Amino acid sequence: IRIFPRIAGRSYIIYGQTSGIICKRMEKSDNEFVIYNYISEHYDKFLKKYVPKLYGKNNDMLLLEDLTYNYNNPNVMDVKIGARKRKSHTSGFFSIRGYTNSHDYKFDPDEYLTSESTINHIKNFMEAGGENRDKTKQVLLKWIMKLSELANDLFEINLKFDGVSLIFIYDDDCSKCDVNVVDFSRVKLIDTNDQMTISAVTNLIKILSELADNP
Ligand SMILES: O=P(O)(O)O[C@@H]1[C@@H](OP(=O)(O)O)[C@H](OP(=O)(O)O)[C@@H](O)[C@H](OP(=O)(O)O)[C@H]1OP(=O)(O)O
Ligand SMILES: Nc1ncnc2c1ncn2[C@@H]1O[C@H](COP(=O)(O)OP(=O)(O)O)[C@@H](O)[C@H]1O
Ligand SMILES: [Mg+2]
Ligand SMILES: [Mg+2]
């Protein structure tokens, strides 16, 4: 058994016994599985664009696509865009839960931040990408392109995305990047769209667009 280098969460996550798969234990209920299936049947396009593939279930374990698999030198950031259980967001509209090398910058997931500190932590996450500005702003722009489409699509989806995170990834060489939505354990059916979750994504798009544009 090989422990998966998580960025955040308390969940039991291991490498699969084969390439490109992780096993996440459903700790408290099978609700994450129920919600993958429900999204599979009602919003399959959403599942295809924005969510790691669910290959299968093994008792309490989900076999998930390893979002880090195709990266020589992956940098990962977990941002919670869904509602916290109780507790307000550490950055108002969202909470950064962790990032690759966040220890080196004295990052603390319990610390409520100003806009300045929030933006500095995202700048911190981007430092591994090096001083070549053209290729780091390409990463920012590919993230903005997918996040924009996600915020657009969220208006047409009647789910409360309580607890869901965005996983931002980029390779050290800035050759490759992505962002995807994870963690549906606390997602709920509702009769409208999720304005809190949409505001989290639009606020991130704002921050990233400010970085992509600064000189
Ligand atoms: O991620 P969602 O679901 O929102 O809730 C998590 C909660 O976050 P928030 O909701 O308070 O942000 C964490 O509290 P934090 O240390 O961040 O204050 C809990 O430690 C964690 O429960 P744990 O697994 O530790 O028992 C929850 O996950 P779960 O309920 O899916 O297990
Ligand atoms: N499919 C995935 N591929 C790669 N890393 C993942 C994947 N899903 C989760 N992770 C990693 O695991 C961490 C916790 O994921 P999450 O599903 O939110 O667990 P929890 O429900 O315990 O919060 C993330 O911060 C990320 O580092
Ligand atoms: Mg989580
Ligand atoms: Mg969870």
mmCIF file of C-alpha atoms and ligand atoms in Angstrom:
data_model
loop_
_atom_site.group_PDB
_atom_site.id
_atom_site.type_symbol
_atom_site.label_atom_id
_atom_site.label_comp_id
_atom_site.label_asym_id
_atom_site.label_seq_id
_atom_site.Cartn_x
_atom_site.Cartn_y
_atom_site.Cartn_z
ATOM 1 C CA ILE A 1 0.000 0.000 0.000
ATOM 2 C CA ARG A 2 1.464 3.398 -1.182
ATOM 3 C CA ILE A 3 -0.057 6.597 0.372
ATOM 4 C CA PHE A 4 -1.045 9.228 -2.257
ATOM 5 C CA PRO A 5 0.640 12.658 -1.688
ATOM 6 C CA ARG A 6 -2.659 14.586 -1.025
ATOM 7 C CA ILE A 7 -2.499 18.432 -0.873
ATOM 8 C CA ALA A 8 -5.478 18.608 1.565
ATOM 9 C CA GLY A 9 -8.464 16.669 3.054
ATOM 10 C CA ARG A 10 -8.373 14.051 5.863
ATOM 11 C CA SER A 11 -9.594 11.230 3.494
ATOM 12 C CA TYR A 12 -7.748 7.884 3.106
ATOM 13 C CA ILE A 13 -6.290 8.077 -0.476
ATOM 14 C CA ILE A 14 -3.758 5.547 -1.906
ATOM 15 C CA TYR A 15 -2.279 4.797 -5.358
ATOM 16 C CA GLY A 16 -4.156 2.080 -7.274
ATOM 17 C CA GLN A 17 -2.276 -1.234 -7.769
ATOM 18 C CA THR A 18 -2.016 -0.098 -11.450
ATOM 19 C CA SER A 19 -0.886 3.111 -13.292
ATOM 20 C CA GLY A 20 -2.963 6.352 -13.439
ATOM 21 C CA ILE A 21 -5.551 5.394 -10.740
ATOM 22 C CA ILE A 22 -6.056 6.554 -7.117
ATOM 23 C CA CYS A 23 -8.341 4.891 -4.520
ATOM 24 C CA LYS A 24 -10.249 7.300 -2.230
ATOM 25 C CA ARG A 25 -12.106 5.767 0.751
ATOM 26 C CA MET A 26 -15.685 7.000 1.314
ATOM 27 C CA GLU A 27 -15.246 7.594 5.101
ATOM 28 C CA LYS A 28 -18.804 8.423 6.362
ATOM 29 C CA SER A 29 -21.376 7.463 3.603
ATOM 30 C CA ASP A 30 -21.599 6.341 -0.092
ATOM 31 C CA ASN A 31 -23.045 9.826 -1.012
ATOM 32 C CA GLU A 32 -20.004 10.725 -3.221
ATOM 33 C CA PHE A 33 -20.793 7.596 -5.362
ATOM 34 C CA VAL A 34 -24.547 8.416 -5.455
ATOM 35 C CA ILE A 35 -23.673 11.950 -6.759
ATOM 36 C CA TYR A 36 -21.117 10.771 -9.421
ATOM 37 C CA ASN A 37 -23.905 8.415 -10.717
ATOM 38 C CA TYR A 38 -26.608 11.147 -10.598
ATOM 39 C CA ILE A 39 -24.352 13.630 -12.497
ATOM 40 C CA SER A 40 -23.535 10.764 -14.941
ATOM 41 C CA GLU A 41 -27.290 10.483 -15.806
ATOM 42 C CA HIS A 42 -28.411 14.177 -15.642
ATOM 43 C CA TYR A 43 -25.316 16.286 -16.586
ATOM 44 C CA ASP A 44 -22.884 13.916 -18.404
ATOM 45 C CA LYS A 45 -21.291 16.839 -20.351
ATOM 46 C CA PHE A 46 -20.381 18.459 -16.984
ATOM 47 C CA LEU A 47 -18.850 15.138 -15.812
ATOM 48 C CA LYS A 48 -16.805 14.853 -19.071
ATOM 49 C CA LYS A 49 -15.516 18.481 -19.124
ATOM 50 C CA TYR A 50 -14.656 19.175 -15.435
ATOM 51 C CA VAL A 51 -14.493 15.945 -13.277
ATOM 52 C CA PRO A 52 -11.877 13.167 -12.935
ATOM 53 C CA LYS A 53 -13.172 9.872 -14.462
ATOM 54 C CA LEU A 54 -14.731 7.408 -11.995
ATOM 55 C CA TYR A 55 -13.521 3.987 -13.324
ATOM 56 C CA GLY A 56 -15.219 1.905 -10.571
ATOM 57 C CA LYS A 57 -16.123 1.161 -6.924
ATOM 58 C CA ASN A 58 -14.469 -1.541 -4.714
ATOM 59 C CA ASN A 59 -16.523 -1.842 -1.454
ATOM 60 C CA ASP A 60 -15.950 1.642 0.125
ATOM 61 C CA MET A 61 -13.151 2.669 -2.375
ATOM 62 C CA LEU A 62 -13.642 4.875 -5.500
ATOM 63 C CA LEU A 63 -11.156 4.192 -8.347
ATOM 64 C CA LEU A 64 -10.498 7.727 -9.707
ATOM 65 C CA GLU A 65 -8.371 9.080 -12.558
ATOM 66 C CA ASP A 66 -5.099 10.423 -11.070
ATOM 67 C CA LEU A 67 -5.178 14.102 -12.221
ATOM 68 C CA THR A 68 -1.355 14.298 -11.528
ATOM 69 C CA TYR A 69 -0.495 11.152 -13.597
ATOM 70 C CA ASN A 70 0.611 12.821 -16.931
ATOM 71 C CA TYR A 71 2.943 15.381 -15.194
ATOM 72 C CA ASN A 72 6.772 15.179 -14.875
ATOM 73 C CA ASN A 73 6.731 17.851 -12.079
ATOM 74 C CA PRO A 74 3.154 18.605 -10.970
ATOM 75 C CA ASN A 75 2.269 21.606 -8.754
ATOM 76 C CA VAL A 76 -1.208 21.172 -7.211
ATOM 77 C CA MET A 77 -3.535 23.682 -5.464
ATOM 78 C CA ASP A 78 -6.816 22.686 -3.676
ATOM 79 C CA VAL A 79 -9.335 25.608 -3.482
ATOM 80 C CA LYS A 80 -12.699 24.900 -1.785
ATOM 81 C CA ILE A 81 -15.376 26.713 -3.905
ATOM 82 C CA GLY A 82 -18.386 24.961 -2.275
ATOM 83 C CA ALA A 83 -19.844 25.923 1.151
ATOM 84 C CA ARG A 84 -17.847 24.907 4.283
ATOM 85 C CA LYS A 85 -19.869 22.746 6.773
ATOM 86 C CA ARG A 86 -19.991 25.642 9.237
ATOM 87 C CA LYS A 87 -17.221 28.344 9.165
ATOM 88 C CA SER A 88 -16.990 31.183 6.602
ATOM 89 C CA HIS A 89 -14.383 31.037 3.767
ATOM 90 C CA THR A 90 -10.762 32.012 4.654
ATOM 91 C CA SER A 91 -10.791 34.312 1.505
ATOM 92 C CA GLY A 92 -14.482 35.400 1.593
ATOM 93 C CA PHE A 93 -15.751 33.610 -1.569
ATOM 94 C CA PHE A 94 -13.431 30.506 -1.408
ATOM 95 C CA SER A 95 -10.763 28.819 0.845
ATOM 96 C CA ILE A 96 -7.327 27.702 -0.386
ATOM 97 C CA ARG A 97 -6.911 24.367 1.491
ATOM 98 C CA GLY A 98 -3.256 23.759 0.443
ATOM 99 C CA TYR A 99 -0.654 23.761 -2.378
ATOM 100 C CA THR A 100 2.637 22.084 -3.409
ATOM 101 C CA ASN A 101 5.435 23.583 -1.168
ATOM 102 C CA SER A 102 2.918 25.652 0.907
ATOM 103 C CA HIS A 103 5.101 24.845 3.980
ATOM 104 C CA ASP A 104 8.028 26.968 2.524
ATOM 105 C CA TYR A 105 5.699 30.072 2.641
ATOM 106 C CA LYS A 106 4.227 29.342 6.153
ATOM 107 C CA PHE A 107 0.735 28.788 4.601
ATOM 108 C CA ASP A 108 -1.906 27.887 7.255
ATOM 109 C CA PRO A 109 -5.350 26.538 6.189
ATOM 110 C CA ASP A 110 -6.943 27.929 9.453
ATOM 111 C CA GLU A 111 -5.772 31.552 8.770
ATOM 112 C CA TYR A 112 -8.450 34.033 7.467
ATOM 113 C CA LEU A 113 -6.770 36.207 4.754
ATOM 114 C CA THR A 114 -7.017 39.696 3.209
ATOM 115 C CA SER A 115 -7.185 40.025 -0.619
ATOM 116 C CA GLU A 116 -3.454 40.859 -0.511
ATOM 117 C CA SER A 117 -2.527 37.620 1.361
ATOM 118 C CA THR A 118 -4.925 35.500 -0.804
ATOM 119 C CA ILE A 119 -3.275 36.826 -4.038
ATOM 120 C CA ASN A 120 0.258 36.357 -2.527
ATOM 121 C CA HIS A 121 -0.459 32.634 -1.791
ATOM 122 C CA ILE A 122 -1.586 32.107 -5.456
ATOM 123 C CA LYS A 123 1.620 33.962 -6.546
ATOM 124 C CA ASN A 124 3.487 31.544 -4.188
ATOM 125 C CA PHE A 125 1.821 28.518 -5.940
ATOM 126 C CA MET A 126 2.984 29.923 -9.345
ATOM 127 C CA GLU A 127 6.690 30.455 -8.244
ATOM 128 C CA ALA A 128 7.699 26.821 -9.208
ATOM 129 C CA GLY A 129 6.755 27.825 -12.829
ATOM 130 C CA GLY A 130 9.920 30.021 -13.057
ATOM 131 C CA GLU A 131 10.623 33.636 -14.189
ATOM 132 C CA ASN A 132 9.526 33.046 -17.862
ATOM 133 C CA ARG A 133 6.392 35.286 -17.657
ATOM 134 C CA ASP A 134 4.978 34.414 -21.156
ATOM 135 C CA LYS A 135 4.622 30.691 -20.227
ATOM 136 C CA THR A 136 3.171 31.314 -16.665
ATOM 137 C CA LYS A 137 0.515 33.694 -18.102
ATOM 138 C CA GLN A 138 -0.368 30.961 -20.736
ATOM 139 C CA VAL A 139 -1.053 28.653 -17.701
ATOM 140 C CA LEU A 140 -3.207 31.388 -16.094
ATOM 141 C CA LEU A 141 -5.115 31.903 -19.417
ATOM 142 C CA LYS A 142 -5.857 28.131 -19.966
ATOM 143 C CA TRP A 143 -7.165 28.076 -16.335
ATOM 144 C CA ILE A 144 -9.376 31.183 -16.979
ATOM 145 C CA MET A 145 -10.670 29.586 -20.234
ATOM 146 C CA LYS A 146 -11.945 26.400 -18.418
ATOM 147 C CA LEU A 147 -13.101 28.234 -15.200
ATOM 148 C CA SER A 148 -15.126 30.735 -17.336
ATOM 149 C CA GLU A 149 -16.889 27.806 -19.100
ATOM 150 C CA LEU A 150 -17.466 26.097 -15.687
ATOM 151 C CA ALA A 151 -19.052 29.264 -14.118
ATOM 152 C CA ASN A 152 -21.211 29.613 -17.327
ATOM 153 C CA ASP A 153 -22.298 25.892 -17.092
ATOM 154 C CA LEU A 154 -22.991 26.104 -13.298
ATOM 155 C CA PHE A 155 -26.014 28.457 -13.987
ATOM 156 C CA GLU A 156 -27.827 25.434 -15.607
ATOM 157 C CA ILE A 157 -27.048 22.876 -12.821
ATOM 158 C CA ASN A 158 -29.461 22.362 -9.888
ATOM 159 C CA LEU A 159 -26.927 20.981 -7.315
ATOM 160 C CA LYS A 160 -25.602 22.520 -4.061
ATOM 161 C CA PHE A 161 -21.811 21.927 -4.395
ATOM 162 C CA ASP A 162 -21.210 21.911 -0.571
ATOM 163 C CA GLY A 163 -17.550 21.005 0.140
ATOM 164 C CA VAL A 164 -16.303 20.695 -3.522
ATOM 165 C CA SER A 165 -12.770 21.826 -4.434
ATOM 166 C CA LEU A 166 -10.992 22.919 -7.614
ATOM 167 C CA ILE A 167 -7.660 21.100 -8.166
ATOM 168 C CA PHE A 168 -5.335 23.427 -10.113
ATOM 169 C CA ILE A 169 -2.311 21.586 -11.660
ATOM 170 C CA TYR A 170 0.617 22.870 -13.807
ATOM 171 C CA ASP A 171 3.954 21.157 -14.694
ATOM 172 C CA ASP A 172 7.205 22.922 -13.518
ATOM 173 C CA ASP A 173 8.075 23.486 -17.234
ATOM 174 C CA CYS A 174 4.620 25.239 -17.799
ATOM 175 C CA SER A 175 4.106 22.858 -20.838
ATOM 176 C CA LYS A 176 0.807 21.445 -19.436
ATOM 177 C CA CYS A 177 -1.920 22.528 -16.937
ATOM 178 C CA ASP A 178 -5.523 21.829 -15.924
ATOM 179 C CA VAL A 179 -8.148 22.471 -13.257
ATOM 180 C CA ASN A 180 -10.987 20.052 -12.335
ATOM 181 C CA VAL A 181 -13.813 19.832 -9.718
ATOM 182 C CA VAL A 182 -13.502 17.109 -7.000
ATOM 183 C CA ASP A 183 -15.136 15.845 -3.761
ATOM 184 C CA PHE A 184 -18.944 15.351 -4.040
ATOM 185 C CA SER A 185 -19.417 13.669 -0.568
ATOM 186 C CA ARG A 186 -21.616 16.635 0.631
ATOM 187 C CA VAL A 187 -23.278 17.614 -2.729
ATOM 188 C CA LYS A 188 -27.141 17.894 -2.576
ATOM 189 C CA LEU A 189 -30.093 18.106 -5.052
ATOM 190 C CA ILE A 190 -31.764 21.577 -5.047
ATOM 191 C CA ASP A 191 -34.430 23.328 -7.238
ATOM 192 C CA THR A 192 -32.156 26.297 -8.291
ATOM 193 C CA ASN A 193 -28.436 26.821 -9.195
ATOM 194 C CA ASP A 194 -25.652 27.406 -6.569
ATOM 195 C CA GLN A 195 -24.953 31.201 -6.475
ATOM 196 C CA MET A 196 -22.306 30.811 -3.663
ATOM 197 C CA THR A 197 -20.292 28.293 -5.777
ATOM 198 C CA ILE A 198 -20.669 30.481 -8.938
ATOM 199 C CA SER A 199 -19.377 33.547 -6.915
ATOM 200 C CA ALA A 200 -16.352 31.491 -5.781
ATOM 201 C CA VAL A 201 -15.441 30.662 -9.454
ATOM 202 C CA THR A 202 -16.074 34.271 -10.779
ATOM 203 C CA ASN A 203 -13.911 35.655 -7.885
ATOM 204 C CA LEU A 204 -11.076 33.223 -8.843
ATOM 205 C CA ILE A 205 -11.469 34.225 -12.551
ATOM 206 C CA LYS A 206 -11.137 37.883 -11.397
ATOM 207 C CA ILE A 207 -7.948 37.156 -9.365
ATOM 208 C CA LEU A 208 -6.305 35.054 -12.176
ATOM 209 C CA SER A 209 -7.240 37.691 -14.865
ATOM 210 C CA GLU A 210 -5.579 40.386 -12.629
ATOM 211 C CA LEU A 211 -2.424 38.179 -12.476
ATOM 212 C CA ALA A 212 -2.494 37.289 -16.225
ATOM 213 C CA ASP A 213 -2.662 41.094 -16.910
ATOM 214 C CA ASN A 214 -0.161 42.618 -14.338
ATOM 215 C CA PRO A 215 3.260 43.836 -15.657
HETATM 216 O O1 LIG B 1 -14.601 19.315 2.982
HETATM 217 P P1 LIG B 1 -16.083 19.458 3.598
HETATM 218 O O2 LIG B 1 -16.988 18.333 3.372
HETATM 219 O O3 LIG B 1 -16.799 20.903 3.431
HETATM 220 O O4 LIG B 1 -15.829 19.384 5.135
HETATM 221 C C1 LIG B 1 -14.566 19.111 5.709
HETATM 222 C C2 LIG B 1 -14.350 20.169 6.753
HETATM 223 O O5 LIG B 1 -14.193 21.380 6.080
HETATM 224 P P2 LIG B 1 -15.194 22.650 6.220
HETATM 225 O O6 LIG B 1 -16.483 22.158 5.706
HETATM 226 O O7 LIG B 1 -15.074 22.880 7.822
HETATM 227 O O8 LIG B 1 -14.201 23.394 5.214
HETATM 228 C C3 LIG B 1 -13.101 19.909 7.483
HETATM 229 O O9 LIG B 1 -12.907 20.949 8.470
HETATM 230 P P3 LIG B 1 -11.701 22.023 8.387
HETATM 231 O O10 LIG B 1 -10.472 21.281 9.106
HETATM 232 O O11 LIG B 1 -11.523 22.347 6.954
HETATM 233 O O12 LIG B 1 -12.386 23.209 9.240
HETATM 234 C C4 LIG B 1 -13.264 18.601 8.198
HETATM 235 O O13 LIG B 1 -12.055 18.342 8.913
HETATM 236 C C5 LIG B 1 -13.549 17.448 7.227
HETATM 237 O O14 LIG B 1 -13.994 16.383 8.021
HETATM 238 P P4 LIG B 1 -13.032 15.271 8.533
HETATM 239 O O15 LIG B 1 -12.900 14.404 7.174
HETATM 240 O O16 LIG B 1 -11.804 15.993 8.960
HETATM 241 O O17 LIG B 1 -13.861 14.553 9.705
HETATM 242 C C6 LIG B 1 -14.711 17.759 6.315
HETATM 243 O O18 LIG B 1 -14.853 16.769 5.242
HETATM 244 P P5 LIG B 1 -16.031 15.633 5.205
HETATM 245 O O19 LIG B 1 -17.307 16.113 6.029
HETATM 246 O O20 LIG B 1 -16.329 15.503 3.626
HETATM 247 O O21 LIG B 1 -15.314 14.490 5.765
HETATM 248 N N1 LIG B 2 -8.581 12.569 -8.906
HETATM 249 C C1 LIG B 2 -7.582 13.131 -8.228
HETATM 250 N N2 LIG B 2 -6.346 13.143 -8.783
HETATM 251 C C2 LIG B 2 -5.335 13.680 -8.081
HETATM 252 N N3 LIG B 2 -5.335 14.189 -6.852
HETATM 253 C C3 LIG B 2 -6.562 14.123 -6.304
HETATM 254 C C4 LIG B 2 -7.704 13.625 -6.911
HETATM 255 N N4 LIG B 2 -8.787 13.713 -6.051
HETATM 256 C C5 LIG B 2 -8.283 14.229 -4.953
HETATM 257 N N5 LIG B 2 -6.945 14.542 -5.049
HETATM 258 C C6 LIG B 2 -6.081 15.039 -3.977
HETATM 259 O O1 LIG B 2 -6.661 14.659 -2.750
HETATM 260 C C7 LIG B 2 -6.959 15.813 -1.928
HETATM 261 C C8 LIG B 2 -8.277 15.602 -1.235
HETATM 262 O O2 LIG B 2 -9.285 15.304 -2.218
HETATM 263 P P1 LIG B 2 -10.806 15.292 -1.732
HETATM 264 O O3 LIG B 2 -11.620 14.456 -2.663
HETATM 265 O O4 LIG B 2 -11.241 16.707 -1.508
HETATM 266 O O5 LIG B 2 -10.712 14.557 -0.303
HETATM 267 P P2 LIG B 2 -11.622 14.861 1.031
HETATM 268 O O6 LIG B 2 -13.058 14.413 0.696
HETATM 269 O O7 LIG B 2 -11.040 14.087 2.179
HETATM 270 O O8 LIG B 2 -11.511 16.354 1.265
HETATM 271 C C9 LIG B 2 -6.895 17.009 -2.878
HETATM 272 O O9 LIG B 2 -6.513 18.171 -2.150
HETATM 273 C C10 LIG B 2 -5.858 16.550 -3.914
HETATM 274 O O10 LIG B 2 -4.520 16.804 -3.534
HETATM 275 MG MG MG B 3 -12.055 18.154 0.067
HETATM 276 MG MG MG B 4 -14.852 15.453 1.487
#
